[PDB]
Amino acid sequence: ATTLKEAADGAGRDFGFALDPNRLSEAQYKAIADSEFNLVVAENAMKWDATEPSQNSFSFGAGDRVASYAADTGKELYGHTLVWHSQLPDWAKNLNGSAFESAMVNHVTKVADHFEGKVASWDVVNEAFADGGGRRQDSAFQQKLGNGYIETAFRAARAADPTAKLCINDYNVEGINAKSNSLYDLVKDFKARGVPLDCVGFQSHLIVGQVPGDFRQNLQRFADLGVDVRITELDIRMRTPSDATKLATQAADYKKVVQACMQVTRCQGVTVWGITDKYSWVPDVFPGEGAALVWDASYAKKPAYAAVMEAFGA
Numbered sequence: 001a002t003t004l005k006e007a008a009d010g011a012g013r014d015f016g017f018a019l020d021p022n023r024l025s026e027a028q029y030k031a032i033a034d035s036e037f038n039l040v041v042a043e044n045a046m047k048w049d050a051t052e053p054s055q056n057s058f059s060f061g062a063g064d065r066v067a068s069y070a071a072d073t074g075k076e077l078y079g080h081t082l083v084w085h086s087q088l089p090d091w092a093k094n095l096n097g098s099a100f101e102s103a104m105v106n107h108v109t110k111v112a113d114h115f116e117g118k119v120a121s122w123d124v125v126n127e128a129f130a131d132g133g134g135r136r137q138d139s140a141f142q143q144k145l146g147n148g149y150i151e152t153a154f155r156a157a158r159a160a161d162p163t164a165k166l167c168i169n170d171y172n173v174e175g176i177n178a179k180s181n182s183l184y185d186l187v188k189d190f191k192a193r194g195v196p197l198d199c200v201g202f203q204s205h206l207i208v209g210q211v212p213g214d215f216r217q218n219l220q221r222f223a224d225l226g227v228d229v230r231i232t233e234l235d236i237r238m239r240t241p242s243d244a245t246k247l248a249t250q251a252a253d254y255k256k257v258v259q260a261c262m263q264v265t266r267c268q269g270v271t272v273w274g275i276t277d278k279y280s281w282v283p284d285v286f287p288g289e290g291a292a293l294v295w296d297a298s299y300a301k302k303p304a305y306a307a308v309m310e311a312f313g314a
């Protein structure tokens, strides 16, 4: 293998990236997208704000651009995300009770129908749980609808799309902890009761030098519930600027994560949350942090590139 795509392809796994369709007009970004990945997810274009800016009025141009990109380049298309507390339009926040439930259901139905037969898997529900265990405490869905909204969303998604893989996705659930235990309890419950649910996403927004040592064990216990698992938003952030020590640790960290996936038969693969440090979400959220991706801000391969290649077994 001379690309990450080749390494993943050879391994029988997915290696994906989060796409901003506007950056496709930057030829270097498109060149790397085209050649280094076999899966794509929309970083932002398929979220609720991006798709339903006013009630029952849909804006699918950006999401369609991502889907068309996947079809044109022969990549698997991963759907993110139908139900998420963050960036919810004010019109939806202003609804309550049955009116809010119906807006959620309509959102799930219309977005899943629109992309049916293109999107292979959906993050149906994103970030439902709380660090330290139990349900998230600043969620419009949890607050307005209570515990049952997750099941409602999954059933609505399956009603719309009979065959898509339906995933629940979260962060800080990579190790075995109160948060991933709560997630585990739900997955086991849903499978026990025949609630549509096929996969679990582990975002893996990690800090350099801090990869959970029990990540493989955790992925395995989820797979053993009878669902597929996926590393969905991998990046590994450091204090900037980078230096040789930090880049080496980061490479070792990327290898640890990709190996944990390789070690679990039902781990579908690994998606990194962007291509280049140039565009990464990290610096805007965590001042003085960044350099979290596989390519730097000038599109030079970092040591993480070789590590990922090696981990896929190339």
Ligand SMILES: OC[C@H]1CNC[C@@H](O)[C@@H]1O[C@@H]1O[C@H](CO)[C@@H](O)[C@H](O)[C@H]1O
Binding pocket: 043, 044, 047, 086, 087, 126, 203, 233, 281
């Ligand atoms: O915040 C980083 C990611 C956490 N897990 C869910 C992903 O959707 C997040 O992506 C970021 O979403 C933000 C809000 O939509 C957006 O401003 C950033 O561009 C995304 O990377």
